[PDB]
Amino acid sequence: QFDLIRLNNGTIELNGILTPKAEVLTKIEKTLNIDELESVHNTFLTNILSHKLFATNTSEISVGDYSGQPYPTSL
Amino acid sequence: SQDYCTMLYEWLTQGILNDPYQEFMTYDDLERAWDTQYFIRKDVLLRDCDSEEDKNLLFKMLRTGILLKVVRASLQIPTIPSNSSDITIQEINDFADLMEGSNLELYVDKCYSRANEIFLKLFFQG
Helix, strand or coil, rough: CCCCEEECCCCEECCCCCCCCCCCCCCCCCCCCCHHHHHHHHHHHHHHCCCCCCCCCCCCCCCCCCCCCHHHHHC | CHHHHHHHHHHHHHHCCEEECCCEEEEEEECCCCCCEEEECCCCCCCCCHCCCCCCCCCHHHHHHHHHHHHHHHCCCCCCCCHHHHCCCCCCCCCCHHHHHHHHHHHHHHHHHHHHHHHHHHHHHC
């Protein structure tokens, strides 16, 4: 029930409000619709893409030492 | 002052801040991302708030309102019904009588105890 977000500096931040542990003063299924399913499929695709071995010709990847070439290029 | 007593009652029973004319003695920012700053306006106060007793009274009222607003924001409810506790606050009708009598202090202590009980129950059970 706790949603965490990581940053580049190694810190962790809680996203949004922290809901109580299911306790409301009182004296169905969470399925995904069309746009939610499409968006989560897009997130799955970009997560597949963001692999270091799949990031071909990108500026975010670091080249291998003593070679000067990225890992996908060496592959 | 019929409007001012109703605004004070709303602030002391639900923590709802609606001051479109800058007349209430307390108003919060974000009208740090989650914790907002509560500024007390001394130009529109009802007392001097210079003595220790008056300062503690003002701080108690502010803490009551803050706890009410926090409970509202956590429960995602627009208002806190009176059935959630065993304490009921009556609306102020005579401003002069409320100022000259201890009924103001009684109502303030009552709503403060109610807000503290609700907050403790919530943070202890949920």
